[PDB]
Amino acid sequence: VPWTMADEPAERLGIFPVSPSAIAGTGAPISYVISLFSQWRGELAAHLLFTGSAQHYGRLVVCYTPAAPQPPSTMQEAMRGTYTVWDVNAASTLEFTIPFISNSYWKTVDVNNPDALLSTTGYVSIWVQNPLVGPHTAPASALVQAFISAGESFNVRLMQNPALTSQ
């Protein structure tokens, strides 16, 4: 996810649903383990690594909203869920926990029906809280590398044909 000094407040930088349409096709190692099986549960650990300069300052709010018919459209609407305002100039990486605020005990890994009640837990999105600032002759942009891996309570069961026939 890129982030420039021209980006104003309440600007969306990224958003993805927590459903087998996204979490199973990120390219991360966890996405391969999820696609092997039919059901999953537990927390997901997100790590946003700030690969900018040591002179840059600003804030990016990371929001997790549970399941709903429509995703959040604005920043303040997304901030009504579980969020964390992350100041980039502290430690390099942000440790954002995606809680398993789920309807049932297990979520199905079906790519054909990702928006089902028993499939998706919600959306996770990145918005610009405070604009990126820094001294003159500093880089006008800063990349943020978003990692995803399994939490300490993450589980999977019921094996399925891998590869998938998707689309």
Partner: protein, 289 residues
């Protein structure tokens, strides 16, 4: 005996599941830690009591007025968040609707008013359920789907406030109806609570076997009111908001109203609704029904 089949019995360790012989496989109870919910009335939710190494690390009605089923035992919840409770502002007896009961209505005639919905199971429900075409029909309404009818009747209540703000809910329901007739009036109404109302279920509730469902009769011979309460039900420990109606109320006629001559040919009825022990999980933005 022990019938000639094999229900389980089960096995383990290599008894009923070895490389020499097999019986039918059975699933075991999942022992989970978490917050105690699911079963209404007995909520009292509290904390409970990775386990693998990594490669990189070193008779009946209208007798009394009791719950149609007894309250069940709580279960550990999958979600870790603490619930939001409306309390006395939410869990209270609300005036759901006021409807008329005329003598023209025959056996098995479902009665519902302005806040009610026409639901015989055959109506094509346009999503979301808050669409006006669902509630306004060419014929008279018949059912009171919970919580859909309750939230529509009072959209500004604290219960509906959390209902439109949380993805899942959990509560019981109590319905009461008051019908005042003089000692010269005769007739009987049945207060049905139908679980997962569908085409076949609603039509069998009109018929003779409908008394398998939770019921109380409002007989004008002795009663002026009848109360019925049901605990929470669902395939999941918490019901999805705006997308699932576990209970539906049906006020149908057993014995047609038989009023005395020279008096009005109809009596007024007042339907009440009471959510019992409400909890809401998963707070996020406002998404109404």
């Amino acid at each position: 005996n022990n019938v000639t089949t094999d229900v389980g019995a089960n096995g383990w360790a290599p008894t009923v599941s070895t490389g020499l012989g097999d019986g039918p496989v059975s699933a075991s109870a999942d022992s989970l830690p978490g917050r105690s919910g699911g079963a209404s009335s007995e909520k009292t939710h509290t904390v409970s009591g990775s386990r693998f190494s990594k490669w990189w690390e070193p008779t009946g009605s209208t007798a009394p007025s009791l719950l149609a089923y007894p309250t069940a035992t709580p279960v550990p919840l999958p979600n870790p968040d603490e619930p939001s409770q409306p309390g006395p502002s939410g869990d209270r007896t609300w005036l759901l609707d006021t409807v008329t009961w005329s003598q023209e209505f025959t056996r098995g005639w479902n009665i519902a008013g302005s806040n009610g919905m026409q639901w015989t199971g055959l109506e094509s429900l346009i999503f979301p359920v808050s669409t006006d075409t669902n509630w306004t029909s060419t014929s008279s309404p018949t059912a009171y789907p919970l919580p859909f009818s309750f939230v529509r009747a009072y959209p500004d209540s604290s219960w509906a406030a959390m209902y439109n703000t949380h993805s899942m809910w959990n509560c019981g329901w109590r319905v009461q109806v008051t019908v005042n007739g003089s000692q010269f009036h005769a007739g009987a109404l049945i207060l049905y609570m139908v679980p997962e109302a569908t085409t076949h279920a609603i039509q069998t509730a009109r018929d003779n076997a409908g008394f398998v469902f939770p019921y109380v009769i409002l007989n004008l011979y002795e009663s002026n009111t009848a109360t019925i309460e049901v605990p929470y039900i669902s395939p999941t420990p918490n019901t999805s908001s705006g997308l699932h109606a576990p209970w539906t109320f049906y006020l149908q006629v057993l014995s047609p109203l038989n009023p005395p001559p020279s008096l009005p040919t109809s009596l007024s009825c007042s339907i009440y609704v009471t959510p019992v022990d409400s909890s809401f999980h998963g707070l996020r933005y406002l998404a109404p029904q």
